[PDB]
Amino acid sequence: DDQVKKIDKYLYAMRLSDETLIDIMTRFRKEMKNGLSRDFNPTATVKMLPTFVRSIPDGSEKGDFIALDLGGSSFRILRVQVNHEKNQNVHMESEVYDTPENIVHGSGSQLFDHVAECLGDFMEKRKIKDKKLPVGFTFSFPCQQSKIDEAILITWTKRFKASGVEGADVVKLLNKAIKKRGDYDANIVAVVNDTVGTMMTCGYDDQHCEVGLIIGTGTNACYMEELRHIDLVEGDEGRMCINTEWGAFGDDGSLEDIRTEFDREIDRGSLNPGKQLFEKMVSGMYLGELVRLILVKMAKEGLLFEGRITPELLTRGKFNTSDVSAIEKNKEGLHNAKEILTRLGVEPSDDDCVSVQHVCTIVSFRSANLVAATLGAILNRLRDNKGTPRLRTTVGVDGSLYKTHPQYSRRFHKTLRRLVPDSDVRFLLSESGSGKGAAMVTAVAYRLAEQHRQIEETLAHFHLTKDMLLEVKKRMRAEMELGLRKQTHNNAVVKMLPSFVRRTPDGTENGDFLALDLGGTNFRVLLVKIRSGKKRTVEMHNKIYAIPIEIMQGTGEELFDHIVSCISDFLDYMGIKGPRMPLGFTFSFPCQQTSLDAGILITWTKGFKATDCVGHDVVTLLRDAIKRREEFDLDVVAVVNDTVGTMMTCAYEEPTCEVGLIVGTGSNACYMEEMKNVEMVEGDQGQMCINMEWGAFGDNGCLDDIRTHYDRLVDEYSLNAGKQRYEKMISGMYLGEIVRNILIDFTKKGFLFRGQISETLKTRGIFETKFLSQIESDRLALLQVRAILQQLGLNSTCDDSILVKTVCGVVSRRAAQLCGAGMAAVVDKIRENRGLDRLNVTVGVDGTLYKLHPHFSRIMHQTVKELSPKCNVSFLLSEDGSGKGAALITAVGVRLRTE
Ligand SMILES: O=P(O)(O)OC[C@H]1O[C@@H](O)C[C@@H](O)[C@@H]1O
Ligand SMILES: O=P(O)(O)OC[C@H]1O[C@@H](O)C[C@@H](O)[C@@H]1O
Ligand SMILES: OC[C@H]1O[C@@H](O)[C@H](O)[C@@H](O)[C@@H]1O
Ligand SMILES: OC[C@H]1O[C@@H](O)[C@H](O)[C@@H](O)[C@@H]1O
Ligand code: NA
Ligand code: NA
């Protein structure tokens, strides 16, 4: 008995006490917290990787798929087919392919071309090639994942080292391999660790399974953690499976007091020197060689075989984990020991067979004990999560060692239940391997992949290519010609209306002017005092007056009576009642003008629909309201479009400015055109500012090409169906409605909001410019996005908030690009007008969508640069409004009136 009580002291360091295993467990409990926290995760050795699997199979899984399995003892390819609907119990066929060491050690090309060739064969053996079966992929290696169908290899472990893989996406790699063959197609829909595949396989049968355990070639475990603990994943709703990759436990010296001279030597001879240290004490790829190393030592010290030693006893890997298991069998161990020890050359004595069988015990007992230490920590985490005074869960298991060693399972279960007896645990053992749990993962993945595909399909229609945009640019330019030319003008949709402003501020303007700003979001009256000379100044005041629902749609007389009434109040407000003042009237609507002071309303746009206004001269209508009140008297000198007012405002200080752009409630533009080109106004000397009214672009159908189902709905339900189509794809009054319709369709399709179309969501105008701008802000936490949505009255989840955000982006982006194509055409026509090769020009811009949106102006400028590369455009934001420009225009008006 001394021959045994002696080994017990020699391999003393490889016998851990419960006191010890407790310290280990405590330490792994910490490693978990560090792996999960976003602050320390990058330093932690236990990666606690997110798997993107939300829960064990429930039964609703259904379909037919192919599963791959690489990284374990054998490279297997399965096929899991199941429909409960047709009442078709889970069914599955599998197979194994030989993969020579030269492949597992060659280039990724070799390895993945190999896997691709085997998948080919496997499919050419059932003729399931033409079947669009979803492929699942079990990859037993640590992987970086941001989505279930992405797997960036962090590092090879166990027996694999293939060049050109670490850091790449094995998904893209396999796809490439297959592609090169063109032998068939394959939709890799998911990738999971074998721990995860195992947890899913067992969960299917045991709805309490919350853990996955692999003790085969290598060791590793996964568990269901609370999303409120997974710092590295946006969300708190529910739970997700974490792949601990605990093999790396202690790769940073953590376990330098547990590791022995033996562990260090096997390491110095291993494939991954320094890494997977905890694992190198456990998995069945090392145990055999650990024993051999211990036996070489003892032998060298004469503790065995008379101190005899052969070349075989010194050869790496002559001792298998098989032999370790074969020696530990109850009835036959010593017999086997003899045989194995005899093949080794040494002269095995019945005593040697007893010592060796004991080294195997100490070594195998330790592996199981360690996995107990760590698993005990996982359970401690679960119980803590639940809060229950007693954990009651199930642990899935798989792996050659655990499956074949006649003493391992037995010993391990006992140690664990002892370290954490405050819990009743069941150890369900996989029998299908991973196929089942894996295919159950693929089912869900594919499901979600299909929705996603339909989504991208719909949103794809909103994507415009460089060439598409250049077409839009070209069409815009053509429509411009049609509008300017007297022959085609009457039918042209882009009216190219003359403003009668012939030049930008010349610096002589001087005086006091009243002003009106009508058509934007805020109607106001202004007082503008301009002083020219050496020391030139501008001083303005204004007041916003609200316009009531009745009035805005109502009778012209009503509307202009309200306006004049507001003018009256403002006069009192400014303490200036009674002098006859010159008035500049900014009226943001298409007007046919025969002079600066006459404007006939061509048609209402945006939200305005007063009766008996269209066809009338708005200056007359105003003069009447002034007459009718008979309080004060004004001298209305000019009517001006906000575009033109904006250009003039910005020209005041920036003489390079010759273009006006508005992107607010509506969208429109203006620019300085050569009189020789304005065929609608007699004369060919100098210039004329042209109010384009480009919102009407597309009204003749020249954009049916790119308008979508959602664009048509918005147009069709608007106050002006069939009109202002281009603007309805750009401005703040409409973008939201477009988005709203997209969402209504997605909800009906079941992609959003659980498929329930809220009353709120059926309220038109819900997505105001302000909301859109907030929703698209950068580095904005989903929690914040979801908050904004609940504010509007939309009860949404993280996934919803994400989809909504994507939709808003697609729409606002398209708007910025379409707007860019228009401006691109404009600046290019100017460049030509001046016969330049390169033109520097600046644009005066105003509008709420333009000011508030965090991407619009940017994408718009970018687009203008790309489409008109021979122009360098500068966009200058107007911060005052139109008052200055309107005033500057009114000044020249007076100089012509008093002329
Ligand atoms: O074959 P081993 O590496 O010993 O054990 C681990 C393997 O178990 C197999 O039943 C399924 C594989 O997904 C897993 O990787
Ligand atoms: O109010 P929005 O329609 O967003 O922006 C357009 C408005 O911008 C205002 O600063 C000046 C108005 O002349 C113009 O109509
Ligand atoms: O296959 C068993 C385990 O081996 C470990 O070395 C790998 O890092 C894990 O991905 C895997 O779960
Ligand atoms: O307010 C911005 C633009 O809105 C368009 O709908 C109007 O018809 C234009 O006259 C105006 O410049
Ligand atoms: Na989280
Ligand atoms: Na002309």
Swiss-Prot record:
**What regulates this protein's activity?**
Hexokinase is an allosteric enzyme inhibited by its product D-glucose 6-phosphate. Hexokinase activity is inhibited by N-acetyl-D-glucosamine.
- What would be an example GO MF term here? glucokinase activity
> Which residues does the annotation say bind D-glucose 1?
S140, T157, K158, N193, D194, N220, E245, Q276, L277, F278, E279
Fetch the Gene3D superfamilies from UniProt: 3.30.420.40, 3.40.367.20
| UniProt KW keywords | Acetylation, Allosteric enzyme, ATP-binding, Charcot-Marie-Tooth disease, Cytoplasm, Disease variant, Glycolysis, Hereditary hemolytic anemia, Immunity, Inflammatory response, Innate immunity, Intellectual disability, Kinase, Membrane, Mitochondrion, Mitochondrion outer membrane, Neurodegeneration, Neuropathy, Nucleotide-binding, Phosphoprotein, Repeat, Retinitis pigmentosa, Transferase
Q: In which tissues is it expressed?
A: Isoform 2: Erythrocyte specific. Isoform 3: Testis-specific. Isoform 4: Testis-specific.
**Residues reported in the UniProt entry to bind ATP 1:** R15, D69, L70, G71, G72, S73, S74, N330, R410, R411
Query: Could you tell me the superkingdom of the organism this chain comes from?
Result: Eukaryota
Specify the pathway: Carbohydrate metabolism; hexose metabolism; Carbohydrate degradation; glycolysis; D-glyceraldehyde 3-phosphate and glycerone phosphate from D-glucose: step 1/4
Keyword presence, Kinase = yes
In this chain, the stretch annotated as Hexokinase large subdomain 1 covers 193-432
Q: Which GO terms describe its biological process?
A: canonical glycolysis; carbohydrate phosphorylation; establishment of protein localization to mitochondrion; fructose 6-phosphate metabolic process; GDP-mannose biosynthetic process; GDP-mannose biosynthetic process from mannose; glucose 6-phosphate metabolic process; glucose metabolic process
Annotated positions binding D-glucose 6-phosphate 2 = D517, L518, G519, G520, T521, D642, T665, D846, G847, T848, S882
Annotated spans, Hexokinase small subdomain 2: 506-640
Location(s), subcellular: Mitochondrion outer membrane; Cytoplasm, Cytosol
Q: EC number(s) on record?
A: 2.7.1.1
The reaction(s) catalysed by this protein are: a D-hexose + ATP = a D-hexose 6-phosphate + ADP + H(+); D-fructose + ATP = D-fructose 6-phosphate + ADP + H(+); D-glucose + ATP = D-glucose 6-phosphate + ADP + H(+); D-mannose + ATP = D-mannose 6-phosphate + ADP + H(+)
Give every Hexokinase domain span. 1-443, 449-891
Please give the residue positions where the record annotates the modification Phosphoserine: S322
Binding residues for D-glucose 2, per the UniProt record?
Answer: S588, F589, T605, K606, N641, D642, S667, N668, E693, E727
Tell me which disease this protein is linked to: Anemia, congenital, non-spherocytic hemolytic, 5: An autosomal recessive disorder characterized by hemolytic anemia as the predominant clinical feature, and decreased red cell hexokinase activity.
What does the sequence similarity comment in the record state about its family? Belongs to the hexokinase family.
What is the designated name of this protein? Hexokinase-1
What is the organism field in this record? Homo sapiens (Human)
